[PDB]
Amino acid sequence: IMQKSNKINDALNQHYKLNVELGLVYAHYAHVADDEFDMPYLGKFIQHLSEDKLGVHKEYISDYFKRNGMKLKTDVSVAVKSIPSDAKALIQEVYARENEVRDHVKAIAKLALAEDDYESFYFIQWYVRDGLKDLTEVDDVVKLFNSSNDKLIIEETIKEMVEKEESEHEIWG
Amino acid sequence: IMQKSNKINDALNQHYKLNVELGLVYAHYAHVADDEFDMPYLGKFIQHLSEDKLGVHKEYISDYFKRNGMKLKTDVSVAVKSIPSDAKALIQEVYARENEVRDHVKAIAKLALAEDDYESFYFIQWYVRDGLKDLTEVDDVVKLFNSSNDKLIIEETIKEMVEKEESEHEIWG
Amino acid sequence: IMQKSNKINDALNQHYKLNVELGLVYAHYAHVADDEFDMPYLGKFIQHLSEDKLGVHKEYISDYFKRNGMKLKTDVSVAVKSIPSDAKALIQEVYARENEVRDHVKAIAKLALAEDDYESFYFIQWYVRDGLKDLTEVDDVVKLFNSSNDKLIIEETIKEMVEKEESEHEIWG
Amino acid sequence: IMQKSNKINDALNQHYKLNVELGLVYAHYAHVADDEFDMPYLGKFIQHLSEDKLGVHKEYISDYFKRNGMKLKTDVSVAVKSIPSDAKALIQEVYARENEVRDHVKAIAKLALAEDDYESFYFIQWYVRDGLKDLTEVDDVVKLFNSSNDKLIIEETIKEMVEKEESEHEIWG
Amino acid sequence: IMQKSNKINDALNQHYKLNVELGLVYAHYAHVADDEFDMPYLGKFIQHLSEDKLGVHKEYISDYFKRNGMKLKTDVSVAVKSIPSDAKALIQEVYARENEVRDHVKAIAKLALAEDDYESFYFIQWYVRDGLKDLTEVDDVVKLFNSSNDKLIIEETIKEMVEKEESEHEIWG
Amino acid sequence: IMQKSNKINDALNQHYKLNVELGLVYAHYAHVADDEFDMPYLGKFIQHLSEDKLGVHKEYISDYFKRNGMKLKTDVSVAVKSIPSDAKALIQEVYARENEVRDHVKAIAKLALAEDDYESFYFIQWYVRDGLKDLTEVDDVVKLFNSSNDKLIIEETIKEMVEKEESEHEIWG
Ligand SMILES: [Cl-]
Ligand SMILES: [Cl-]
Ligand SMILES: [Cl-]
Ligand SMILES: [Cl-]
Ligand SMILES: [Cl-]
Ligand SMILES: [Cl-]
Ligand SMILES: [Fe+3]
Ligand SMILES: [Fe+3]
Ligand SMILES: [Fe+3]
Ligand SMILES: [Fe+3]
Ligand SMILES: [Fe+3]
Ligand SMILES: [Fe+3]
Ligand SMILES: [Fe+3]
Ligand SMILES: [Fe+3]
Ligand SMILES: [Fe+3]
Ligand SMILES: [Fe+3]
Ligand SMILES: [Fe+3]
Ligand SMILES: [Fe+3]
Ligand SMILES: [Fe+3]
Ligand SMILES: [Fe+3]
Ligand SMILES: [Fe+3]
Ligand SMILES: [Fe+3]
Ligand SMILES: [Fe+3]
Ligand SMILES: [Fe+3]
Ligand SMILES: [Fe+3]
Ligand SMILES: [Fe+3]
Ligand SMILES: [Fe+3]
Ligand SMILES: [Fe+3]
Ligand SMILES: [Fe+3]
Ligand SMILES: [Fe+3]
Ligand SMILES: [Fe+3]
Ligand SMILES: [Fe+3]
Ligand SMILES: [Fe+3]
Ligand SMILES: [Fe+3]
Ligand SMILES: [Fe+3]
Ligand SMILES: [Fe+3]
Ligand SMILES: [Fe+3]
Ligand SMILES: [Fe+3]
Ligand SMILES: [Fe+3]
Ligand SMILES: [Fe+3]
Ligand SMILES: [Fe+3]
Ligand SMILES: [Fe+3]
Ligand SMILES: [Fe+3]
Ligand SMILES: [Fe+3]
Ligand SMILES: [Fe+3]
Ligand SMILES: [Fe+3]
Ligand SMILES: [Fe+3]
Ligand SMILES: [Fe+3]
Ligand SMILES: [Fe+3]
Ligand SMILES: [Fe+3]
Ligand SMILES: [Fe+3]
Ligand SMILES: [Fe+3]
Ligand SMILES: [Fe+3]
Ligand SMILES: [Fe+3]
Ligand SMILES: [Fe+3]
Ligand SMILES: [Fe+3]
Ligand SMILES: [Fe+3]
Ligand SMILES: [Fe+3]
Ligand SMILES: [Fe+3]
Ligand SMILES: [Fe+3]
Ligand SMILES: [Fe+3]
Ligand SMILES: [Fe+3]
Ligand SMILES: [Fe+3]
Ligand SMILES: [Fe+3]
Ligand SMILES: [Fe+3]
Ligand SMILES: [Fe+3]
Ligand SMILES: [Fe+3]
Ligand SMILES: [Fe+3]
Ligand SMILES: [Fe+3]
Ligand SMILES: [Fe+3]
Ligand SMILES: [Fe+3]
Ligand SMILES: [Fe+3]
Ligand SMILES: [Fe+3]
Ligand SMILES: [Fe+3]
Numbered sequence A, B, C, D, E, F: 001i002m003q004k005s006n007k008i009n010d011a012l013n014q015h016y017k018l019n020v021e022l023g024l025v026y027a028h029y030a031h032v033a034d035d036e037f038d039m040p041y042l043g044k045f046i047q048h049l050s051e052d053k054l055g056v057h058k059e060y061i062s063d064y065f066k067r068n069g070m071k072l073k074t075d076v077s078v079a080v081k082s083i084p085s086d087a088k089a090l091i092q093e094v095y096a097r098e099n100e101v102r103d104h105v106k107a108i109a110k111l112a113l114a115e116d117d118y119e120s121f122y123f124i125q126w127y128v129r130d131g132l133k134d135l136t137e138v139d140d141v142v143k144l145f146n147s148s149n150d151k152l153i154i155e156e157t158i159k160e161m162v163e164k165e166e167s168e169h170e171i172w173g
């Protein structure tokens, strides 16, 4: 009884993989934001997202697997072979990737209900909430590139974003 | 003048790659130590090593590159396709990989002197020191599997290792 | 036995001279940044670099000489006979001079190894590290002139640079 | 109206030059006091005078020039080509140079009145007061070499001079 | 791989031996400074040097050997069969022995580079720095015997040396 | 009157020698306990005994000699040419050596009474008390190797022995 769902196990190993590979791309994008685009605070913002993906995002999946008999797979391949041409396109690409996360997570929630896997549906709620929270944070930075042509003005707003004391939203936090 | 050494740039991108891929293997080994071998404290010890490799070990290289004109490359491929058969062999494999780190780092230091790259020789001293410090920490855990046949006795000593307040050794710390 | 190297003694007296003369040029550049270019915070940034060169940079050499039998020479000649035409060129010239420091320091380290002067190789590591740290700090200001056309926007970022509480980087600090 | 006096501008650039060059000579004399005469506290006393000349003494002139339209000139040449033969003669030479400062400053005050430059007469009062204060401090050390033949006894008194908490005299402080 | 260098192992066992035997000679010299020369503070100064040699100087070598597979050898023979004839010659002999330490350490650093033993080159930097720091401290006491003919005056300065709160020099400390 | 006893002077120089040579053997045994037997806490216990022998045990004798006209001799020869084959035999050898200390000290006390040297009889009481206190501490570790076959269990008890806050026994402390 209570035998783990192989399909959920697969989708969650795929999501583990995505979060590792995303985190490694974001670490590269963070380097480039500072080094090539002269935007160290944009770099810090993207580096923090890197550490979220390679941190709690993958960690919680590994922890979940230990509780329920699911098997962890580590199979990672990613190469950063071209970069967006400027900072605005850099954060727009981060935006595009986070939007894809929301769609991947939606599939996992739908699958958990289909499997009558209510522990997995419960578990994935964190990723449902964080999918939109993460997109909103990236959106707040995308907006800046449309509200000013001055990189240092943009950088000052990003600086207060990354140095603000995090206070969770009651629902999305 | 002061034009970066392409050979050092390559060896340091290779070392960036190694630290990413090691860190991902250690994250898997940490999961297995808890989940399969029933050694959660060994898991925590290896997980902390995972975060060191994916943390300051790669970070300092990226930071160095921004200072001197070297180019960062992100090109990662690793798959955990078999695991050691028990906890003793698990930590012995971690030991073997850390010993290899010492040898990779030795080559980079030797190369920096050959290139008369004294900023790179200075930079790599951190990795020279940390190579032996890391090996010593893993060695301290390997010894436990040779001093007791009882996994819970071993686990209690590892627990005080991972929960000790870190106090740096004057030379190796 | 342990008789001081005359060649190192010469190269270090030359480096003492450079740091005095640089410091005096930077004191002039600091005056001009405020007085002619209306950039008092750029002035404060360059004045702080002035005091570093005329402070610990020369002091440590004098202190080293007292320990090992090397002779100090004071022979200083510098005249500021033209200035860069605007603030961007002013900080670019500071950048050029700091890059030259890295090259002078590299020669001294190479020479210490050639002389088997390991106390001097140890001593010069401070200047190896500080060569890149100083260049990075000046680079951070150069970038600002490429990220905004507004001198007051640039000045606000420099102000937070000079008024930040200094926290040393683990390697370069 | 209120057009700066070219003669005062010249005399103050000359005084800027003197304070730089004095400060560099005192830095050398400080090294020699410790290194050759075995008087580290005499060295510290002279080093503190070095930092005063290269510090507020020149700084206030640069700051004054920014307020009133005077032009700063940086033109420095000094070489320490012989040293006094012992510590008593070393501090006697420092005394002689400080006495010359009083005479240079007197000329500037006289000139400010001749030019009806009351801002400059006000500004130079600091240097009038400090001229005598500095001479008195050096005189206090000269006296020691006439009150004891024992260098360590002299050194102990100098040590309490340099380590005393500075408390300004109501007039000369 | 990473097999320890037998030559470094030998030179470091020899340096372990030197530090033991020096420490035992200094313990005797400390006794004599008080008992025969009536200089208890000179005795305390030399006793502190005794404890440094028999303390961290040998300890760090033993600790290093445990990390890398080098073998410790304990083989000690020293007899104090004559003493210098007065306190000045006593501290001059201590000076001579510390100068020899600098030369022994220089050979070990040179050897580590020859062996491409970068962990050993890193390890020995502590002894490179401490070689000159120790010599400077002994030099400060030698100078006293040339600056006064009064043993109690000399003793008072040594007393403030040994009772000062140690504050490390940024480079040599 | 009150002329020092030459026989006591000899026996106390011999005891000074024993404590130096014992301390050096214990420093080696401490290294081996950690490095070869994988018992770092046993190593710390023996290292602390090393520092006692080379510390107050010899120090008090040197201090005594300064008070009464006895002459200090430094004549040290010891080589560790074989080690016990395991940790139990290592601590049993330490036990054997401490038992010999009790017998050496007994001879000195007996001799002081024979010489009517009541200052020496008083002085040696410290060593009479410490002879048994030291043996008891080593005995407490010997017992552990007879109460468990598990080196890590033994190590945990030794760890609380070496990390306990020392509280002196009213008589033996
Ligand atoms: Cl199902
Ligand atoms: Cl090159
Ligand atoms: Cl040479
Ligand atoms: Cl006029
Ligand atoms: Cl080799
Ligand atoms: Cl008698
Ligand atoms: Fe399947
Ligand atoms: Fe750049
Ligand atoms: Fe940066
Ligand atoms: Fe966040
Ligand atoms: Fe978790
Ligand atoms: Fe599993
Ligand atoms: Fe597995
Ligand atoms: Fe590819
Ligand atoms: Fe790509
Ligand atoms: Fe851009
Ligand atoms: Fe664009
Ligand atoms: Fe999109
Ligand atoms: Fe579905
Ligand atoms: Fe949630
Ligand atoms: Fe997130
Ligand atoms: Fe290439
Ligand atoms: Fe299980
Ligand atoms: Fe667990
Ligand atoms: Fe750690
Ligand atoms: Fe960093
Ligand atoms: Fe690049
Ligand atoms: Fe790139
Ligand atoms: Fe594969
Ligand atoms: Fe594998
Ligand atoms: Fe197992
Ligand atoms: Fe096995
Ligand atoms: Fe191995
Ligand atoms: Fe090479
Ligand atoms: Fe380091
Ligand atoms: Fe590490
Ligand atoms: Fe316990
Ligand atoms: Fe020459
Ligand atoms: Fe103006
Ligand atoms: Fe201003
Ligand atoms: Fe700074
Ligand atoms: Fe200094
Ligand atoms: Fe000299
Ligand atoms: Fe000179
Ligand atoms: Fe000229
Ligand atoms: Fe010029
Ligand atoms: Fe401008
Ligand atoms: Fe321009
Ligand atoms: Fe340049
Ligand atoms: Fe050279
Ligand atoms: Fe440094
Ligand atoms: Fe600097
Ligand atoms: Fe603002
Ligand atoms: Fe004119
Ligand atoms: Fe000297
Ligand atoms: Fe000094
Ligand atoms: Fe003052
Ligand atoms: Fe001012
Ligand atoms: Fe002007
Ligand atoms: Fe100008
Ligand atoms: Fe000249
Ligand atoms: Fe001269
Ligand atoms: Fe003199
Ligand atoms: Fe004279
Ligand atoms: Fe005069
Ligand atoms: Fe006049
Ligand atoms: Fe005033
Ligand atoms: Fe003054
Ligand atoms: Fe051999
Ligand atoms: Fe006496
Ligand atoms: Fe005494
Ligand atoms: Fe010390
Ligand atoms: Fe140690
Ligand atoms: Fe060994």
Ligand SMILES: [Fe+3]
Binding pocket: E072, F032, F083
């Ligand atoms: Fe041995």
Ligand SMILES: [Fe+3]
Binding pocket: E079
């Ligand atoms: Fe002999």
Ligand SMILES: [Fe+3]
Binding pocket: E079, E080, E081, E082, E083
């Ligand atoms: Fe002798």
Ligand SMILES: [Fe+3]
Binding pocket: E037, E085, E086, E087, E088
């Ligand atoms: Fe004497």
Ligand SMILES: [Fe+3]
Binding pocket: E086, E088, E089
């Ligand atoms: Fe003499």
Ligand SMILES: [Fe+3]
Binding pocket: E095, E096, E097, E099
């Ligand atoms: Fe000598």
Ligand SMILES: [Fe+3]
Binding pocket: E110, E111, E112, E114
């Ligand atoms: Fe060699």
Ligand SMILES: [Fe+3]
Binding pocket: E125, E126, E129
């Ligand atoms: Fe050091």
Ligand SMILES: [Fe+3]
Binding pocket: E052, E053, E057, E130, E134
């Ligand atoms: Fe030392």
Ligand SMILES: [Fe+3]
Binding pocket: D156, E156
């Ligand atoms: Fe006094």
Ligand SMILES: [Fe+3]
Binding pocket: F006
């Ligand atoms: Fe006799």
Ligand SMILES: [Fe+3]
Binding pocket: B139, F035
């Ligand atoms: Fe081992």
Ligand SMILES: [Fe+3]
Binding pocket: F034, F040
């Ligand atoms: Fe250890």
Ligand SMILES: [Fe+3]
Binding pocket: F052
């Ligand atoms: Fe004790």
Ligand SMILES: [Fe+3]
Binding pocket: F059, F060, F063
């Ligand atoms: Fe004592």
Ligand SMILES: [Fe+3]
Binding pocket: E035, F069, F070, F071, F072
């Ligand atoms: Fe005696």
